Amino acid sequence: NQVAPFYADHVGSILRTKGIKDAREKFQSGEITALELRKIENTEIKYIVEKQKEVGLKSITDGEFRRWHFDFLENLDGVEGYSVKITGPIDFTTHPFIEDFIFLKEAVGDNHVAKQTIPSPAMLHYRGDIEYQPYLDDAEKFANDLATAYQKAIQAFYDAGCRYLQLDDTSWSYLCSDEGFDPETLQETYKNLINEAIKHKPADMVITMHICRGGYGPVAETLFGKLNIDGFFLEYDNERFAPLKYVTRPDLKIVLGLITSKTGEEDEAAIKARIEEASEIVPLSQLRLSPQCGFATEEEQWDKLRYVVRLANDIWGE
């Protein structure tokens, strides 16, 4: 048991089955209609919903089967794909992700928690080409609206019954090495953007953040010390526990993605040691396990999940 991210949790995306694979093809082909492709998706999602439950998972997603990033953004007023172009004032009114959640929530039940993933608001700032004149003249203006667009977004998800929302942010990984563009400045615009975006976060709602590559050393100060997020899904390799754990908050749980979700190799004693090492820097009481990223062979997939469930079980629970 648990509340926020569970000892055995997962990023969210799941491998596309052949049903969803075949369908998405006939659609762009012209054989099936948008209003028709949804049904299959509904069947497929339902199939993966049960599987996450049969492996032991407590948090269940829709495996991002309907395809959770630029689709979410391009559905915000003032934004439209063509990357995403910001051509008007950012806003939220009626997003398609609301019914997709209601659907998921339906299939999950009351004995499990529905997890919803959307990109981080800072994902629009970067991968988005600002075209609007005002935002182009005043950056603060852009950040403000985008944050309200998110306050309203989150509220709409909450109202829909979401109690576990995750922000996928792959922007921090960029300013982690190599390189420059805007060093030592983005972490600020972003940290303030994120906190503002989730400023009006209900007490019973959990908002985790997936930092895709991974809590590097640089973006580790403002991330675990300044960011007002509940949990963090950090991914690690087999060969490296980085004292960057500036996490002083006894409620800031950080999920450790020690399970390879791409290859297949994998020692058990290594993971236990690795976690153990982490437990030294930050109490085991507030650490979680999961595979490194979201899955995206099927058999192998769920097997690694039951592996997460087994490990977290014999590790957590004292």
Side-chain angles (χ1 to χ4, degrees), residues 21 28 39 44 68 72 88 91 95 101 105 116 142 169 188 207 214 220 228 234 241 299-300:
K21 212 80 181 300
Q28 306 177 311
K39 273 293 181 189
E44 293 314 289
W68 275 204
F72 175 88
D91 194 28
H95 204 283
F101 178 68
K105 173 108 177 169
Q116 170 64 72
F142 173 60
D169 202 337
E188 202 65 353
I207 292 192
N228 293 307
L234 305 164
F241 203 108
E299 186 196 87
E300 242 281 74

Side-chain angles (χ1 to χ4, degrees), residues 217-264:
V219 297
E221 313 296 62
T222 85
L223 255 188
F224 311 133
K226 298 184 182 173
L227 228 305
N228 293 307
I229 242 165
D230 300 296
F232 274 110
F233 283 72
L234 305 164
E235 63 165 301
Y236 304 99
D237 228 7
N238 217 301
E239 201 206 15
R240 216 181 60 59
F241 203 108
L244 296 310
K245 322 305 293 170
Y246 269 63
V247 42
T248 45
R249 291 164 40 190
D251 76 279
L252 172 62
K253 49 201 71 63
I254 76 103
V255 186
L256 300 161
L258 315 183
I259 282 57
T260 59
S261 53
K262 291 193 299 186
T263 319

Side-chain angles (χ1 to χ4, degrees), residues 22-311:
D22 285 351
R24 295 194 67 69
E25 296 195 305
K26 287 180 182 57
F27 171 64
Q28 306 177 311
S29 170
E31 306 196 10
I32 304 302
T33 57
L35 46 150
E36 196 185 318
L37 163 66
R38 187 164 183 93
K39 273 293 181 189
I40 303 156
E41 297 192 318
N42 275 194
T43 306
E44 293 314 289
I45 292 185
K46 277 203 181 71
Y47 169 70
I48 67 174
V49 170
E50 253 305 67
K51 295 301 157 179
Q52 297 182 58
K53 293 147 74 177
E54 290 170 22
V55 294
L57 269 26
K58 190 175 193 72
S59 75
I60 284 70
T61 64
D62 74 358
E64 288 174 49
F65 275 32
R66 303 174 194 292
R67 296 201 65 270
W68 275 204
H69 166 50
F70 63 80
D71 273 293
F72 175 88
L73 294 166
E74 75 163 303
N75 274 111
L76 289 170
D77 175 293
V79 185
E80 192 52 283
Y82 247 149
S83 288
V84 281
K85 312 284 166 297
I86 292 79
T87 64
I90 310 293
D91 194 28
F92 181 115
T93 293
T94 50
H95 204 283
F97 278 35
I98 305 295
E99 232 316 291
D100 303 338
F101 178 68
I102 296 169
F103 177 81
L104 170 88
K105 173 108 177 169
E106 166 220 49
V108 177
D110 54 0
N111 269 297
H112 309 71
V113 178
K115 181 174 177 176
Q116 170 64 72
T117 70
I118 65 180
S120 176
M123 280 276 74
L124 180 53
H125 175 284
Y126 178 46
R127 289 237 67 69
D129 306 293
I130 306 80
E131 221 168 65
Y132 200 12
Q133 266 76 196
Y135 300 159
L136 216 47
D137 296 332
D138 186 47
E140 310 188 306
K141 212 286 183 63
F142 173 60
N144 301 186
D145 298 5
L146 179 60
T148 291
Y150 264 80
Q151 289 157 180
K152 304 207 271 269
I154 295 176
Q155 199 57 55
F157 269 113
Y158 181 84
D159 306 350
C162 188
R163 250 50 143 185
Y164 192 178
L165 196 71
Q166 168 155 304
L167 269 27
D168 280 25
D169 202 337
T170 188
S171 73
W172 307 81
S173 69
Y174 288 81
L175 55 165
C176 286
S177 57
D178 271 285
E179 290 289 294
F181 295 83
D182 311 295
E184 301 138 300
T185 155
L186 285 180
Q187 292 189 60
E188 202 65 353
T189 65
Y190 292 359
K191 170 216 64 192
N192 297 294
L193 172 56
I194 308 312
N195 289 318
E196 187 187 356
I198 62 171
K199 180 190 169 193
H200 300 136
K201 191 260 291 188
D204 60 341
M205 182 184 60
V206 180
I207 292 192
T208 55
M209 184 134 121
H210 175 46
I211 308 296
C212 206
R213 282 291 189 60
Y216 266 106
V219 297
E221 313 296 62
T222 85
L223 255 188
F224 311 133
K226 298 184 182 173
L227 228 305
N228 293 307
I229 242 165
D230 300 296
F232 274 110
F233 283 72
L234 305 164
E235 63 165 301
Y236 304 99
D237 228 7
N238 217 301
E239 201 206 15
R240 216 181 60 59
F241 203 108
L244 296 310
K245 322 305 293 170
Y246 269 63
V247 42
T248 45
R249 291 164 40 190
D251 76 279
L252 172 62
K253 49 201 71 63
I254 76 103
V255 186
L256 300 161
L258 315 183
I259 282 57
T260 59
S261 53
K262 291 193 299 186
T263 319
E265 310 72 45
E266 54 173 74
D267 355 307
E268 184 180 318
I271 297 162
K272 295 173 169 191
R274 228 124 247 293
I275 298 160
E276 163 267 312
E277 191 182 19
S279 77
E280 219 91 60
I281 304 167
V282 294
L284 185 75
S285 58
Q286 42 181 299
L287 294 180
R288 277 60 180 150
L289 180 63
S290 78
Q292 59 177 55
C293 191
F295 305 89
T297 74
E298 292 187 61
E299 186 196 87
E300 242 281 74
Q301 182 185 61
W302 294 300
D303 279 1
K304 290 179 152 298
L305 282 182
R306 329 187 85 110
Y307 189 46
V308 171
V309 175
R310 184 191 332 158
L311 273 289

